[PDB]
Amino acid sequence: SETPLLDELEKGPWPSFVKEIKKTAELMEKAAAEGKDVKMPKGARGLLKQLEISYKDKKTHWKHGGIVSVVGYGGGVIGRYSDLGEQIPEVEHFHTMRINQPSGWFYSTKALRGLCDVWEKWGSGLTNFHGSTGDIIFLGTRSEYLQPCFEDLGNLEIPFDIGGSGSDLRTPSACMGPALCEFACYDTLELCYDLTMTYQDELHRPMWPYKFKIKCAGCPNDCVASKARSDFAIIGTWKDDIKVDQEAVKEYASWMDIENEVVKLCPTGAIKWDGKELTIDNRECVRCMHCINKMPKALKPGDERGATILIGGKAPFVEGAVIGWVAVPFVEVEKPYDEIKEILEAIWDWWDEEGKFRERIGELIWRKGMREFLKVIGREADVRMVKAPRNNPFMFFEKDELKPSAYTEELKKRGMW
Amino acid sequence: SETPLLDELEKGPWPSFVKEIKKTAELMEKAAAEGKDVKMPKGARGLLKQLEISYKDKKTHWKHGGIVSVVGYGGGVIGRYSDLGEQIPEVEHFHTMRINQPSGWFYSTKALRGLCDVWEKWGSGLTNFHGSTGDIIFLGTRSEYLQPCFEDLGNLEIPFDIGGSGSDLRTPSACMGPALCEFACYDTLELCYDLTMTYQDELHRPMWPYKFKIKCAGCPNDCVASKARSDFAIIGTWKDDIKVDQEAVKEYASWMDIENEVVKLCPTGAIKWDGKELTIDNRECVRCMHCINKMPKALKPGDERGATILIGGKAPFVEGAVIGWVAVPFVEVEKPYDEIKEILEAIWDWWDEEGKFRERIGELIWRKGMREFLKVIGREADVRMVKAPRNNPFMFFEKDELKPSAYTEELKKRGMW
Amino acid sequence: EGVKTDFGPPYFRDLLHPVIAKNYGKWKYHEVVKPGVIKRVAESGDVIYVVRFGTPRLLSIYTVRELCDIADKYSDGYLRWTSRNNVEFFVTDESKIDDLINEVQERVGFPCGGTWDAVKGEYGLSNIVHTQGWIHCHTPAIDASGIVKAVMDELYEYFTDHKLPAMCRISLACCANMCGAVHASDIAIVGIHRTPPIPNDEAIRKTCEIPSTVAACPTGALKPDMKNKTIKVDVEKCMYCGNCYTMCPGMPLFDPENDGAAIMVGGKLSEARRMPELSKVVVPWVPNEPPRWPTLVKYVKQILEAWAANANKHERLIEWVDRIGWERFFELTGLEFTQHLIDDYRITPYFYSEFRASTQFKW
Amino acid sequence: EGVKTDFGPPYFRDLLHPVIAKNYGKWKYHEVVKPGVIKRVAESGDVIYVVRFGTPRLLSIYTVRELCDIADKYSDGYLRWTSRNNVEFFVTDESKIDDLINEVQERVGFPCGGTWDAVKGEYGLSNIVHTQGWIHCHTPAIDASGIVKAVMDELYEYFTDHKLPAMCRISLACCANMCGAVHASDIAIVGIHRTPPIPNDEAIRKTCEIPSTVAACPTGALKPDMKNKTIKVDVEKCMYCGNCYTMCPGMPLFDPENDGAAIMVGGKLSEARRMPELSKVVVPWVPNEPPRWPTLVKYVKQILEAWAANANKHERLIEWVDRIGWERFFELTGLEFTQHLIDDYRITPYFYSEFRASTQFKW
């Protein structure tokens, strides 16, 4: 065998990525042998060979990449080079193209066959469905193929644009929401598409101190992991009462241990069941979703719908990993989403002016303070922004909050204050 | 009136500090008028006058003090000077002497009359029972009286030494413990006295990077607030079963709502009551004291007694206020307390070698890490030291834990590693 | 010969009442008889009654002498103070208790009480732990003695009777380095400045070691100015902690019109029911209004009465909040949440939040 | 003509299945048929069956074409992927439900499953979210696709059933840069280095943005040597994150023998029952063992099966821990607490612990 280590991973019940690579290699080589226009027939086999050596060595064989892009864009293509250049020349250049997904990864066969045809012609035949951010990954191509691949994507009957990379607005993503989910508090897919479209320039042409990510979740269940994986997490919610179908609850009560599986599990004890009537103190409810999750036929999100915005979510780098925290307790999500757009724009202006090289929004807020951040987005401080008031008396006071005094005059006179 | 603002504070039911000051003034002046040997008859009146002006101005009238002490000691006396020197000369110098208390602030009348006699002769007549650390405060004397006051304290039938101040071991303190308390897990008063005496030099002659505080609590109720107000908090505990008198529980059960006031209030749900038998799962108990606090006639601390040591407790300055955290889950408290003394000594050696100017032990541990600290005290890492494992993968590995490799050889060859 | 040194405090065992010395470490149980009065029953059968009185802490030696006469008359010449500066007497003859209580009241004016009974779940308010304020300290933002008196006058009824459903500790600190355990108390009053320091270059040169003054600033707001051999302050970063003035006379930041107190809430030290916690700010600031501090007093009282009216038996302030959340806490207390109350204290490491700051753990 | 730009991805609404398009935002209730199969009901009174399959993420376009061939005569030409790299199908006529599951198994070898029903309370395992490893990435310590395959082999049956008390998510990251939901997953595998970086002075002067390489070190182990013109590394302060290599090709901290993975545990995203949580390291290091990573797989199973055994219905891992404590967690999982598990990452601020990292609050 040419690949004894990777062959081990063709064994076992779970579908094999090695099989995916080999299948690509065989059929790309066959396609080129039949005279089909395929520029990179050996790309997938080259990848396999490199990966086998990497399994033998227990290390990567990719080096720091030179910076590359398609004409007019500064992002969406990642340069990647193999330190096994001479030995495996077919993967010396092996770049990734990030392709913007439809909202909620919904496809038709026609849309997908288009992508398959372009990538077969110009790339390795290897893809990721999907990249962690949400993009379709075109895994492995040369520099001179990037532009004509892009031209073809744009000319498809169902055309696909490049996603984001570098210091830009990344490709937004969204949960299925109102497509399949009865929990939906807003149209996630529509919001996602609208933002992607409104801020095409921000996405294609990186201009910021670092990357910025937006993700849209239909309800608190947070099915796109927005609060950990996006800088700006838009999570559906409501303001009024949970709707309760009483007869439906009774149907559940005949078989479900509602006391133990629902009542006792509510973080705030807002939900009660006596055998006849279900009761919810919506003043005490924190919209955690559990009770609704438990009884979808009986329980529903209220009518006054919108989103809570969580700011700061990120991976560790520099200052520590972040689950986003409350920036805006409630905002309406209605086309054309002017309220959400005003927030974003204000944040970007400020971040571009004040941010350091490679400083994420979360780190900027930590450095500049919540006060500055709130006045930037033009919002008031709210107790719902904290799990608890500060545990120390070390407060900043603004000049205008101080009583006039001989001392304040002294500060004024010195030129400080 | 000479003091119209302070007079307001002679009104109201709560006993008045102003009355305390005026009483002192009148009777010190009277004592000096009868020819008694009183060096500072006007000290208390001078304090009153200054305090009135301070009430009028809403600011302090004390300035940064010069450094002063008694012969042979570098600590226990705080220099304090008034910026109202020429106007009120009797408080120009007004120093504080910290006098070491008996363990648990137990006194006899003879002991106290001794103190009152010395302070009457040499000081203002003003005292604090007690200073927050535990010491008796001799509030207000001149520089030339410090030494002869100390000589007299030492010559008393029941003699009193100076406590700590500056960068030293401060006067240790302890809760009443077994003197009065049936909850006591060790002899707090004895341990307190023993440390005070073992480390007289450390206390009288500051030699460390900053101050260091020890406090002894006989049980988790922590009636001396050791975990917040001492660097080294010695808190009584046990290892075996809570002792349960079943018939005494039944006596309680006739009038006490045990289900609601005890069972449901245990943090871990280790205690159950069925109407006949009380049960405690001591594997699940965390010795929080509530159930025992609730039923002292029925429930007692186990027989295998000792202390948990909490390290770091301090006020905010520099890096933040600290409730001490677990350094030693369990140590025996048996005269002559060699195990506890070894821990202290190891810590002090390390802290004196590695500490920065004005760095507290808590801050040092934060800067050097728990690993270094544990090897200093020669203890192993324990899950009971954390509320949770670290939320990030950024771990230091020691040289000896690494597998030998070409790379480790490279580090060795460069001179790093 | 020489002056004696290094001899320490008098050994406490020489100073215990005979009955306490005899029964040391041999107690059966205690019973809170009435406010101020605790009965302790020994395994021997001895019964002693520990009677407690509030005090202003600052004592006249003439008051100590008076307390001593009373001690000789009712407790065989033995007394103690507590760790919150109340005073206690030991009475063997139960028929003599009320004589002592009334004689203390008549002679020194100290109220019997300051106790609590976990057994029936009824609690008094004990003394307020406090530091020196303007009586003796050079770095205070507020005055300790005055505020304590002013708040105890208003809350007096709570010291003399068991009127509250759980423990409530009120502690005062006259500046931010919070001498005392004010930072871990149910209701903490903490003095603060709101104005940055004005470098006095002459005083700094003469009296301040620059590098350590610079290093004392938690926010990095001080930089050395080698040229004029002094310190420069970046006011954008100063949060008026006062630390640099602790280190350096040439860095005063007092403003008598903007100095004042913050009110913090929800500290716990005991392990009972739930873990210890540090206090949290709920009122950013109230001015110094000597001699009665009415604005400060009113908010303390407002907070106490709100918790007292809603707390279940045993539920200390933080346990109350545990149940109802901060949204309702600010509502029920009639307090405003403002941006001031969002922690921006950057130097404190996140990792300390992951350390077990408590003796609650399983074996 | 030129080349057209700024047009974006296709409008999703045109890529919707008729019934899904019609009943948009107008659904009544969902019902999990079996494992892999969710029935969906709309106000109108129309029924569609979502059918979910596990995918290796990395896909041949020929596997995609074959997914399309399936999609036509089963789901009217439409399909989706999920946030966890699973391919869903939309089936109408439901006699035909089961040979679908088969032809997929026959053609692409993707197994139906990855679902859960909260209602009864029976959860199965879903796909592992991950990155590139040695397939495409230049900073990795471990290999995603490989470890995923190995773990998912030992954890197949779970994914194909609802053999679980509660919901459990597993995630993988190839380095400390941590791509995916690894910082907040019930179980997480994170590529770590245990070895400092040896400076390559030879290429640091030609490439590498020097002062920004120095600025991008979290512990400050890097000092910009100016002589000489290179970067010198204080090994005392390096915790081997690998971030300096992301910034500079002349900082390889790669030691194949010492690079491995940590296992972290108890992260939550959903708000249900309890607030979301970041994951915690419980196994410091397991070795890189191509091809089957036994030691890694062993510890993942050990942990998964221990919680599985003991957890109540809906009791996720962090929830379990809330109940038993970490003391009992390590005992039950057979893992050893070492000093490595005590946090020492200085730069993160304490005040983040006070921020509401969650939608759970009251109006």
Ligand code: SRM
């Ligand atoms: C006299 C004194 C000890 C001393 O050496 O001076 C003391 C004595 C007792 N404490 Fe305490 N505690 C004393 C300060 C404290 C303080 C420390 C402080 O406030 O600075 C607290 C810690 C405060 C905190 O948690 O924030 C303290 C927390 C407790 C606990 C906790 C109650 C709770 O629900 O959290 C118990 C429980 C109880 O109520 O029985 C307790 C109970 C007791 C018991 C009942 C123990 C016993 O078995 O006899 C003692 C009788 C007190 C009573 O009134 O019922 N003691 N106790 C203390 C002096 C205080 C005073 O004059 O008012």
Ligand code: SRM
């Ligand atoms: C298909 C998918 C939506 C999508 O747009 O892709 C999805 C769909 C649903 N999720 Fe989810 N969740 C999906 C990702 C998630 C993930 C996000 C992730 O793992 O990256 C979790 C958050 C994980 C976390 O909390 O750490 C997620 C948290 C939930 C919650 C949480 C359950 C809990 O006890 O915490 C609900 C509750 C439930 O079980 O009904 C939920 C329930 C649902 C419901 C039942 C909503 C509904 O009313 O129909 C959907 C049916 C799924 C099912 O299996 O029962 N879904 N949802 C998701 C893709 C995952 C997959 O292929 O397996």
Ligand code: SRM
């Ligand atoms: C006398 C006493 C107040 C009282 O009336 O009770 C006191 C008074 C002073 N304290 Fe303190 N502290 C007193 C107990 C405390 C305690 C509590 C304790 O010891 O139980 C603490 C908190 C625990 C701690 O130390 O962290 C305390 C924390 C401080 C701070 C904080 C240092 C820090 O690391 O954050 C300052 C600053 C300093 O160290 O220079 C300080 C400094 C001072 C200074 C020297 C004022 C200053 O800023 O330089 C004090 C001057 C009072 C005077 O001149 O009359 N004092 N101080 C307390 C001691 C009497 C006694 O010995 O019994």
Ligand code: SRM
């Ligand atoms: C190191 C850095 C930032 C940088 O450019 O130096 C980074 C670089 C990168 C970029 C570098 C670049 O921008 O050229 C690459 C190269 C790796 C590197 O460390 O340099 C990369 C591969 C991916 C890939 C695979 C693409 C491929 O084929 O390589 C994906 C998946 C995808 O394409 O959607 C991906 C999606 C994330 N990548 Fe990524 N990625 C980082 C995190 C992330 C995640 C976790 C975002 C986050 O912070 O939450 C992403 C996953 C969640 C999400 O939904 O966005 C990340 C650290 C964030 C921070 O500030 O701490 N990164 N990230």
Ligand code: SF4
């Ligand atoms: S986040 Fe809410 S609306 Fe979106 S798929 Fe999940 S449960 Fe449905």
Ligand code: SF4
């Ligand atoms: S949504 Fe959550 S907090 Fe609200 S009643 Fe239901 S289970 Fe309770």
Ligand code: SF4
């Ligand atoms: S700490 Fe414990 S032993 Fe000491 S007085 Fe308090 S309850 Fe008694």
Ligand code: SF4
């Ligand atoms: S000591 Fe505390 S945890 Fe233990 S049984 Fe009593 S109340 Fe419960």
Ligand code: SF4
């Ligand atoms: S709290 Fe502040 S003002 Fe009060 S005595 Fe201590 S240092 Fe001085």
Ligand code: SF4
């Ligand atoms: S008052 Fe505090 S923040 Fe301001 S300069 Fe001084 S130490 Fe720094």
Ligand code: SF4
């Ligand atoms: S950044 Fe880390 S997790 Fe992401 S692809 Fe690179 S090595 Fe893998």
Ligand code: SF4
């Ligand atoms: S590996 Fe991380 S800690 Fe070490 S020098 Fe590089 S950036 Fe700094």
